[PDB]
Amino acid sequence: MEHYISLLVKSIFIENMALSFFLGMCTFLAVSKKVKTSFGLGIAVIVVLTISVPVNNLVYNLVLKPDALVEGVDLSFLNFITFIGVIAALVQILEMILDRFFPPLYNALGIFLPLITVNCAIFGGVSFMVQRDYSFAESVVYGFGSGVGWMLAIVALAGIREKMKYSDVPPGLRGLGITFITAGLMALGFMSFSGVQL
Amino acid sequence: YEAAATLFYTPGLVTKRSSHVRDSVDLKRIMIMVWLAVFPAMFWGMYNAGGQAIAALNHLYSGDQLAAIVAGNWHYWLTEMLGGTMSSDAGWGSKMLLGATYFLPIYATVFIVGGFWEVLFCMVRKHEVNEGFFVTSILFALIVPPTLPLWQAALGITFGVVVAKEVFGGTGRNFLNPALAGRAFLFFAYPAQISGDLVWTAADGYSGAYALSQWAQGGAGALINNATGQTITWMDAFIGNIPGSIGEVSTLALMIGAAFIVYMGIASWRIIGGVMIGMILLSTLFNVIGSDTNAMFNMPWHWHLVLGGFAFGMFFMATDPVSASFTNSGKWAYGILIGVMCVLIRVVNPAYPEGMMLAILFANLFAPLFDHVVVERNIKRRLARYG
Amino acid sequence: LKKSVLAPVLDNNPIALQVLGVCSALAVTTKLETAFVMTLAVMFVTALSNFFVSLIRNHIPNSVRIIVQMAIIASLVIVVDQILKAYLYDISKQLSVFVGLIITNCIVMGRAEAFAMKSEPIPSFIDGIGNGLGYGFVLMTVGFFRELLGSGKLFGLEVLPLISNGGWYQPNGLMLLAPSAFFLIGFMIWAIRTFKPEQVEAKE
Amino acid sequence: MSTIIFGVVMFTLIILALVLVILFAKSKLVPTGDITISINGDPEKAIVTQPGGKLLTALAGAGVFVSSACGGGGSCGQCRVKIKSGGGDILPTELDHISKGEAREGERLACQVAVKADMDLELPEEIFGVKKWECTVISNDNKATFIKELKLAIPDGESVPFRAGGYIQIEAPAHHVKYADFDVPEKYRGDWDKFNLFRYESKVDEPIIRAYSMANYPEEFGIIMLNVRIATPPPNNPNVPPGQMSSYIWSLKAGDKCTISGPFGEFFAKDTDAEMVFIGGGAGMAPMRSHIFDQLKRLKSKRKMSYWYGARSKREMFYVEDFDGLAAENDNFVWHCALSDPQPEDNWTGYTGFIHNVLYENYLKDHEAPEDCEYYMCGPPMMNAAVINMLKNLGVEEENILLDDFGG
Amino acid sequence: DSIKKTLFVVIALSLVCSIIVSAAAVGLRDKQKENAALDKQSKILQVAGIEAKGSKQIVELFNKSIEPRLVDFNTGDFVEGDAANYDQRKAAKEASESIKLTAEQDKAKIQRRANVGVVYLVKDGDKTSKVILPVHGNGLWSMMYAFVAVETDGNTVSGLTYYEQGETPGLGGEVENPAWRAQWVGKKLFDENHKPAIKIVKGGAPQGSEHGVDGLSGATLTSNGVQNTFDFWLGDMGFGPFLTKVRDGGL
Amino acid sequence: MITIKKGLDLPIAGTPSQVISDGKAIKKVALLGEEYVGMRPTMHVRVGDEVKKAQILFEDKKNPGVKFTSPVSGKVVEINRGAKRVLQSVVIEVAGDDQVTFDKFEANQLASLNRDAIKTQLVESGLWTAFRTRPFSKVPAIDSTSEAIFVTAMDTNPLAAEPTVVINEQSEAFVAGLDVLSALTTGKVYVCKKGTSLPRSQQPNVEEHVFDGPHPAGLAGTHMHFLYPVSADHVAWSINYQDVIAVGQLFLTGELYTQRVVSLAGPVVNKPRLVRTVMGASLEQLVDSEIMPGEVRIISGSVLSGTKATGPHAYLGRYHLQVSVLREGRDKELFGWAMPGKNKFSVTRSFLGHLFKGQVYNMTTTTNGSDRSMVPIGNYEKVMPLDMEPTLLLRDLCAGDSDSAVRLGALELDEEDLALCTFVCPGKYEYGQLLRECLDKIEKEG
Numbered sequence A: 001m002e003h004y005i006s007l008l009v010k011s012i013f014i015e016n017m018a019l020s021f022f023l024g025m026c027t028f029l030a031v032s033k034k035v036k037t038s039f040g041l042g043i044a045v046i047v048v049l050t051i052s053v054p055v056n057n058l059v060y061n062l063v064l065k066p067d068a069l070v071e072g073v074d075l076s077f078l079n080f081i082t083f084i085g086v087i088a089a090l091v092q093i094l095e096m097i098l099d100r101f102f103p104p105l106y107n108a109l110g111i112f113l114p115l116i117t118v119n120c121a122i123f124g125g126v127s128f129m130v131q132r133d134y135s136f137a138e139s140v141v142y143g144f145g146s147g148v149g150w151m152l153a154i155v156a157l158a159g160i161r162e163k164m165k166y167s168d169v170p171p172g173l174r175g176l177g178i179t180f181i182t183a184g185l186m187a188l189g190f191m192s193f194s195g196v197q198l
Numbered sequence B: 001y002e003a004a005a006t007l008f009y010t011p012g013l014v015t016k017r018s019s020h021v022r023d024s025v026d027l028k029r030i031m032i033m034v035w036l037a038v039f040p041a042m043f044w045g046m047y048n049a050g051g052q053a054i055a056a057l058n059h060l061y062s063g064d065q066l067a068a069i070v071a072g073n074w075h076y077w078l079t080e081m082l083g084g085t086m087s088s089d090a091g092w093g094s095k096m097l098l099g100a101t102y103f104l105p106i107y108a109t110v111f112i113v114g115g116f117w118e119v120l121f122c123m124v125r126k127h128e129v130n131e132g133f134f135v136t137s138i139l140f141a142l143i144v145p146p147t148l149p150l151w152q153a154a155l156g157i158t159f160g161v162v163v164a165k166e167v168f169g170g171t172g173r174n175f176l177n178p179a180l181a182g183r184a185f186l187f188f189a190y191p192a193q194i195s196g197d198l199v200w201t202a203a204d205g206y207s208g209a210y211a212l213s214q215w216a217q218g219g220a221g222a223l224i225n226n227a228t229g230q231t232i233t234w235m236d237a238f239i240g241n242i243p244g245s246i247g248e249v250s251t252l253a254l255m256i257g258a259a260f261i262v263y264m265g266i267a268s269w270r271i272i273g274g275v276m277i278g279m280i281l282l283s284t285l286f287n288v289i290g291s292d293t294n295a296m297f298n299m300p301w302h303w304h305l306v307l308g309g310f311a312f313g314m315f316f317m318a319t320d321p322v323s324a325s326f327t328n329s330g331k332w333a334y335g336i337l338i339g340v341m342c343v344l345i346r347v348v349n350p351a352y353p354e355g356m357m358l359a360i361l362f363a364n365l366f367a368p369l370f371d372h373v374v375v376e377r378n379i380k381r382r383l384a385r386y387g
Numbered sequence C: 001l002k003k004s005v006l007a008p009v010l011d012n013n014p015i016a017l018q019v020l021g022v023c024s025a026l027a028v029t030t031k032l033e034t035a036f037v038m039t040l041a042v043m044f045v046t047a048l049s050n051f052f053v054s055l056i057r058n059h060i061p062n063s064v065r066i067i068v069q070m071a072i073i074a075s076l077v078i079v080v081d082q083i084l085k086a087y088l089y090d091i092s093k094q095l096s097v098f099v100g101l102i103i104t105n106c107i108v109m110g111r112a113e114a115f116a117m118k119s120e121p122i123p124s125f126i127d128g129i130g131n132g133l134g135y136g137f138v139l140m141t142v143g144f145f146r147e148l149l150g151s152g153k154l155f156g157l158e159v160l161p162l163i164s165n166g167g168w169y170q171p172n173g174l175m176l177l178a179p180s181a182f183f184l185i186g187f188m189i190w191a192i193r194t195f196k197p198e199q200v201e202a203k204e
Numbered sequence D: 001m002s003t004i005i006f007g008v009v010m011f012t013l014i015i016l017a018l019v020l021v022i023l024f025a026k027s028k029l030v031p032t033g034d035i036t037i038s039i040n041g042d043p044e045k046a047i048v049t050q051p052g053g054k055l056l057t058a059l060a061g062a063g064v065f066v067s068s069a070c071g072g073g074g075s076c077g078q079c080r081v082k083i084k085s086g087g088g089d090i091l092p093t094e095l096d097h098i099s100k101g102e103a104r105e106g107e108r109l110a111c112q113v114a115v116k117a118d119m120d121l122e123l124p125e126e127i128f129g130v131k132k133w134e135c136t137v138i139s140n141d142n143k144a145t146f147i148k149e150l151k152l153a154i155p156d157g158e159s160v161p162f163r164a165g166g167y168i169q170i171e172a173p174a175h176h177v178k179y180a181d182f183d184v185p186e187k188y189r190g191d192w193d194k195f196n197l198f199r200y201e202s203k204v205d206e207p208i209i210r211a212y213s214m215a216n217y218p219e220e221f222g223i224i225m226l227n228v229r230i231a232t233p234p235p236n237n238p239n240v241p242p243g244q245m246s247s248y249i250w251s252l253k254a255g256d257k258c259t260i261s262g263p264f265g266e267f268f269a270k271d272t273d274a275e276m277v278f279i280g281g282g283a284g285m286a287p288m289r290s291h292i293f294d295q296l297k298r299l300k301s302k303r304k305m306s307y308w309y310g311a312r313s314k315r316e317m318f319y320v321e322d323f324d325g326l327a328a329e330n331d332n333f334v335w336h337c338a339l340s341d342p343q344p345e346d347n348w349t350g351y352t353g354f355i356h357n358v359l360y361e362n363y364l365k366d367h368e369a370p371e372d373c374e375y376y377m378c379g380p381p382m383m384n385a386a387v388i389n390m391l392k393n394l395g396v397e398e399e400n401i402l403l404d405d406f407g408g
Numbered sequence E: 001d002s003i004k005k006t007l008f009v010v011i012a013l014s015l016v017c018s019i020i021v022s023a024a025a026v027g028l029r030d031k032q033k034e035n036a037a038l039d040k041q042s043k044i045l046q047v048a049g050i051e052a053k054g055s056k057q058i059v060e061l062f063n064k065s066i067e068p069r070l071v072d073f074n075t076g077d078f079v080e081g082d083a084a085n086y087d088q089r090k091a092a093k094e095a096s097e098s099i100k101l102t103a104e105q106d107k108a109k110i111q112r113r114a115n116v117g118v119v120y121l122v123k124d125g126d127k128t129s130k131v132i133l134p135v136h137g138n139g140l141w142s143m144m145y146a147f148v149a150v151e152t153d154g155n156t157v158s159g160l161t162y163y164e165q166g167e168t169p170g171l172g173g174e175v176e177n178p179a180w181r182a183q184w185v186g187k188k189l190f191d192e193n194h195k196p197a198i199k200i201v202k203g204g205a206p207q208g209s210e211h212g213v214d215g216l217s218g219a220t221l222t223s224n225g226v227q228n229t230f231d232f233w234l235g236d237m238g239f240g241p242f243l244t245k246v247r248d249g250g251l
Numbered sequence F: 001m002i003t004i005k006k007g008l009d010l011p012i013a014g015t016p017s018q019v020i021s022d023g024k025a026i027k028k029v030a031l032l033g034e035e036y037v038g039m040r041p042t043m044h045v046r047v048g049d050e051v052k053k054a055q056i057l058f059e060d061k062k063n064p065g066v067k068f069t070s071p072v073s074g075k076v077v078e079i080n081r082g083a084k085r086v087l088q089s090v091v092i093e094v095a096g097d098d099q100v101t102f103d104k105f106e107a108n109q110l111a112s113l114n115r116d117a118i119k120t121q122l123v124e125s126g127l128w129t130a131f132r133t134r135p136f137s138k139v140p141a142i143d144s145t146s147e148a149i150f151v152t153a154m155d156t157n158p159l160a161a162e163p164t165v166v167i168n169e170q171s172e173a174f175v176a177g178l179d180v181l182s183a184l185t186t187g188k189v190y191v192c193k194k195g196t197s198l199p200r201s202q203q204p205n206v207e208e209h210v211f212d213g214p215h216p217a218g219l220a221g222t223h224m225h226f227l228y229p230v231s232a233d234h235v236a237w238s239i240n241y242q243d244v245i246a247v248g249q250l251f252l253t254g255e256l257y258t259q260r261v262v263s264l265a266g267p268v269v270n271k272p273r274l275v276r277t278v279m280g281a282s283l284e285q286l287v288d289s290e291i292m293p294g295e296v297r298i299i300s301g302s303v304l305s306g307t308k309a310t311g312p313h314a315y316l317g318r319y320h321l322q323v324s325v326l327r328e329g330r331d332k333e334l335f336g337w338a339m340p341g342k343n344k345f346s347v348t349r350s351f352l353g354h355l356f357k358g359q360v361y362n363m364t365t366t367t368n369g370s371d372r373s374m375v376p377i378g379n380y381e382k383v384m385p386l387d388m389e390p391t392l393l394l395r396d397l398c399a400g401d402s403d404s405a406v407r408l409g410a411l412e413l414d415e416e417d418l419a420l421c422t423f424v425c426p427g428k429y430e431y432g433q434l435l436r437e438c439l440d441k442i443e444k445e446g
């Protein structure tokens, strides 16, 4: 369908929030050393942001939308509460299930879950969903697109920092500064799709 | 001074261990050979700039007011006395002279300030002055609008050297194209000086649109140039008589230069093949789809191949081995990706008229990911124990 | 004592030595009048949250400590949000989501999980104020070096006349985008690590 | 006004539902079962604990504590253990002191192992015998300006089994001791007065454990002999706290007893019989004398070696009554020394300066085959660096160079 | 067990924090609602020309002068109701009060149009001198919203101000330039044939032109956007049926 | 496996005519102590002692045993130590004919001996210094055994002797060597031969595999890839054909066989030929009067992978079958980097060399251009034929990492093959020695 593919490509390439909204950088610039290390984190972000968007959208359209529970009353001033609470509960439960029911997958996904239990890149996604007021069928697609775009961005940065093993960075900038400059140049590259419509 | 003998002479050293014979090709030869490959394009671009300037200016002004104008900016103030006249039938002696008077200050400032940065950093780290600066200086000076003031170019090259290449550790150590980063700096920080309709023609007080941008607002019959009033045809844009930048015209006069290096093995032909196949495939797809809106949907591949800034970028910017992928099968992916982007962001992105400068910076980021994928496949093969 | 609060300014800078709190830093600094409010909010929220969590540090459980700590920090951020929308709503519109993003701004997370969980409430409060001030130093310097070049103004008050009014300056367009923050922070890190050499990273 | 309580109850309900779901998941999935740790391969006894604890700290509660010198802090870098089951998940923090080749056979850093499932240990036999004793100091002679010959009386004359070069564990309680009452001879009292070392004191409120290496050789039992070094802080930094454990031992009085424990083997002499070169510095005199006595008085192997020592002055010289006798007693053993700045009354003739130059100029530079012998160094870094640089210049490698330090 | 020791503390802290959170939330709601208006009040007063310094004065003279009103786009007639709390932005988001436009209808690139809008009238008494019209269209990067002030003749523009545009400053978002705004005084919306004749002229409109306004320097997409916005919202599917009545009188 | 389509065999001047001829007199013969990777010296001799042929001369203290034997009788004259007391060369002077005798067998017995007996006799003789383990190039331990023993019955090094002429002379000795090798495997013996015909053995364990094409199609490293991929857990052994001849002579007669055939040739060699000599002969005395007047650098081994032989190193290496000479190119040329030289050479088409088919150059030892960072220009792709991607493996090697090099396949190589990729590099790096450093690091930390 035009809408349910346009929204996906939109979230994937035009507003990559790793590099167009610039969220989640505290881990973007921290866990980026090996491609086969950042791939697992990308997968974990994909699953967390594909799960936490639909449930939050359901609860928002059910009990925190104004007049949705009782006419003339609203509960706008606890949306942050419920978003962060459901995010933390889902992360904890998923980590416990990963360690219990399917142990071999813990090495690939379960280890990374305690890091992203709270994060800008996920909270901002939830807030943007609630701000743009999506329906469920498009909200799930938006969440999946956001996750996959974040995974793509972090994997590309891991590849760049792997290739840069031949560099001769000056001693002062060694590490953190060169990572920041690389991310800035990455933004300069990704400014290509600033104006396209979808 | 007498110190230039270091870069004139060969050092005259001998090997010490391992292979005691060495191939005679080297970095100092490669850079200079690229430096000598653009000339059949640079001279034509200078001539074209002079011609467009003369045609537009004499189409606009005449008489005593024209005398005042030619007694205005130092371009005309100098070329009127140095052996030429500003009339409508002027030939080489005025056209090329005006083009050179426009181009030389930009180059002489870019080269000086970039060389200052390079010598400062090289003296701080105490290595020999690298030879990868001439190519970047030429390839940046060749891709700016003629009316661009000197200090904006100085800031652009300063950014493109210090922020993109020099900090990462010099030639061969960086990961993104220095000259294209330098042009992106201007393209994003001063849009009213590098893009538009008032900077593409050297004539003072004249308005002339980018050749490509006219199709974005009208059909194939809207490619009209107001220099004297004619129609821009495919053969016209292929010979390179359209308005445009100082060096990105005359696709033929640039292909003649680029074929030399491509045949010589300096530039990989795999990337060129991949970019061409991607561009033709995606443009044919768009043409088949079609739509009454966004008039650019109908331009075919043979029209895309010559318009605007495609040929020069494809032949020189893409083939940069440091930025490009390394694996033999990854070069194809790099080429196809850049070929898709240079049409996608020019067809379905109305905000920007020119695309290659963005597409190269986009694909440089994904250059090593293809390398990693191919390497992982090869390692899987080896662990399967078949070589 | 006075001598120990300035450490997060240079010695243990939260954005220079460690990687906490970068999203707000690189997103808010488009102006200066917004950077000041963002730094005051971070300072006050961090200080109060550390004080409270250290006050009740001996009775909360470690099984679900995440929920309790994010509840006690959310009950403060959801108050500062209403305060901003009641007094400085003209500023608050500009920050948009980032005013709410103080929930997960890793400064509070790290400081609460590192210091207030095992220290006395008053040192926890002082630690919070110090870390906030250290973060605010970088915030304000990046804000100055962005706004002054991007608009010829500081705190929304003209200092460099623009070319529209025949001024000496032309507003740089790139500074108003995001990649300006990245390079500015990078050169800031270079200066910090070259004037305080003991923080230089290792080779291998 | 009405919506305030409504928001309150909704907030409480949603938080309670979240916590209820979290605990409903927790109380049905987490194993929380008994975990059994085998101290050896099919051992006589096992340990049962709860998951989540550190392996070394859990095991130390039942015994068989390890030779780690930081007590679980990960600072020693030598809490090496071997486990062949439970988990092969080597941690990146263990790679600091574990190698790719050695990791393949289940060796681990116990300080970084967190217990989650059943696993088995394969610790060597001799570790199981670690225990504690309390002994009385019977001689605390001041053999030099900064050393003491601390003699201990072992209870019941028990012959503790050990190899030369091993180290025992000693504990000390909280203390407050001033240096004005230490046993210093009047000749060395002038040297102490030179910087007024009597004025120093230290306040310690904690128990402290360290490691000490015995001077006597294994065939000598019932009496254990330890050398203790000066505990003063550097004069250039007067406010640096002094050596706590060393201060306690220096202040320990005759007749009064202290607790000893943990005879741990390390720095073993090689099984071969090649020529040996013995270089010592400062407090390494105890392991040097132990190793010298060991094979000679116990094994009687027909080896050949020499002991080279460096001293500030003749005042800092001791054990000459033993070395000058043994050298004449047997032709297999020689000993030499050099003085840095001997006093005019020392009447010294022979080698002077630092030990490295005299070693090179007297023995190594004209040796027949320096690459077929062994080297042992036990001394301060300012001598260790010089001797190792000399030896690497001479052409010996890591497999022949053996050394350690006395905790700094 | 930790069960009771966790439930007790979590419920106690929830009760502790919910009361303060809710008290803060409901306490400031009045101030939020009141302060949400000034950012638009300043623009409306400035476009009407009644300068007011300070929020107190701004609300005072707006309460004195301007009367909000509603209008039906079809037939160009007024409707009953109140406009002080009418959400024009939301009115386009619901089918009951909006219609999705088609290809020939979508000249402003909005795709949505409310069935009943809001029109502001400035008064010096029981008669109207100027009438403010809120008009919006789609630019290059995003939407733009603006006020066009016309006199009671239904022909002349008295002032134009864009209170939020979201374009690139310097060339795109130059619509906020006071000099560019000062051009719009005296221009004419319609011609003799009653058709909308406002034209954005590139390179500078001819001096004294009655239908031209200078095109934005180097922002042709933005100039085209503003031209499309006016050409749509002055047509018979916009404020044209109402403008006919403005010229008919009774304003 | 039968063909290769990459790599450029270097067109040099002074190719040797493949005709065996007698050689000059030999005075000093030495054993080099640095080419034996990982070996550390423990000598059983002192300056002035007297030794016999095949007698133990020195043994290494790393490996258990693997005694190195003097190649001919005489007396020890000097021991040239190096910096940090490394063993460089043990020079002995030829005198007398005292030798150590070993057991002898018959032709029929040579296929069914006992493996332990064969190994004992071989290691006691000292020919065990020949075999090298492919993943690390070190001589195998005294007791190890692997199922793949590769015999290099071809040679495609530049200006090198043709094995078809040498093997044909000894004839049945090669067959005896192959038959005795057939039992020292536990696997199979692979002999890599050109399209021509070679003496053939009747043991089903051995095999014949045909290879032909450019230069890299003759090294054991490349022979590995298409027949038995070497891994960390699958080591394999390689030996040149003359050592097979020596082993066959040993187990057929009972005395160590020490003669060698060296292909003295080069750009500056007055008259190339196939010389007969004893291993480790003094190069300065072997090349006497065969040089034309001029400053020359005597280089042992093949030109791409040899070691300079000035002074203490002036002796034939154990693993080298050829000697070369080059003219010292110390001259400085004005704008020579840009001058379109007719006589210059380059793998890329950036010079006039590739226009003239079959032209022959007098290449010298000039390192064109100083050290610069490698771009690269995709030069290595035309060179390396093994199924691996070198244009980034070389970057990894130059970065100092070892963990990823092992993954990419740095194990399957050595300085024997990577020299060709060092030769074509534009940055003028030394990947040949860099690979040795990386392999040493992996061996140490492994």
Ligand SMILES: Cc1cc2nc3c(=O)[nH]c(=O)nc-3n(C[C@H](O)[C@H](O)[C@H](O)COP(=O)(O)OP(=O)(O)OC[C@H]3O[C@@H](n4cnc5c(N)ncnc54)[C@H](O)[C@@H]3O)c2cc1C
Binding pocket: D069, D167, D210, D211, D212, D213, D214, D227, D228, D229, D231, D232, D233, D234, D240, D241, D242, D243, D244, D245, D246, D247, D283, D286, D287, D405, D406, D407, D408
């Ligand atoms: C295996 C082994 C064997 C040993 N064998 C012997 C032996 O045979 N004989 C022997 O004498 N010792 C030996 N030692 C060393 C023994 O552990 C000493 O007691 C050691 O000095 C620790 O004792 P301490 O804690 O009293 O002193 P430490 O405090 O560890 O060191 C004393 C010195 O350090 C200074 N100091 C204290 N705290 C600090 C600080 N925070 N910063 C800077 N300087 C500080 C003190 O002022 C003083 O100068 C051995 C150690 C080991 C590990």
Ligand SMILES: Cc1cc2nc3c(=O)[nH]c(=O)nc-3n(C[C@H](O)[C@H](O)[C@H](O)COP(=O)(O)O)c2cc1C
Binding pocket: B187, B188, B191, B195, B196, B197, B209, B210, B213, B351, B352, B353, E140, E141, E167, E168, E171, E172, E173, E218, E219, E220, E221, E222, E223
């Ligand atoms: C970075 C950048 C951003 C731009 N943004 C806008 C914009 O927001 N609106 C606009 O009308 N033009 C914008 N432009 C300019 C247009 O792309 C283009 O130059 C203009 O439409 C000139 O068209 P013309 O030649 O037909 O007059 C921008 C240019 C650049 C380089």
Ligand SMILES: Cc1cc2nc3c(=O)[nH]c(=O)nc-3n(C[C@H](O)[C@H](O)[C@H](O)CO)c2cc1C
Binding pocket: B030, B031, B034, B132, B135, B136, B139, B170, B171, B172, B173, B174, B176, B177, B178, B179, B180, B266, B267, B316, B317, B318, B319, B320, B321, B322, B323
């Ligand atoms: C074929 C070729 C193309 C090049 N293209 C560029 C280019 O587009 N821009 C540039 O700045 N340098 C270019 N260079 C110069 C050089 O490779 C560049 O600065 C590298 O990024 C340096 O590492 C080129 C060099 C070669 C050989």
Ligand code: FES
Binding pocket: A023, A024, A025, A026, A027, A119, A120, A121, C020, C021, C022, C023, C024, C104, C105, C106, C107
């Ligand atoms: S990543 Fe944005 S605050 Fe942590």
Ligand code: FES
Binding pocket: D056, D068, D069, D070, D071, D072, D073, D074, D075, D076, D077, D078, D079, D109, D110, D111, D112
């Ligand atoms: S307990 Fe100290 S290193 Fe592990």
Ligand SMILES: [Ca+2]
Binding pocket: E088, E133, E134, E135, E136
């Ligand atoms: Ca409106």
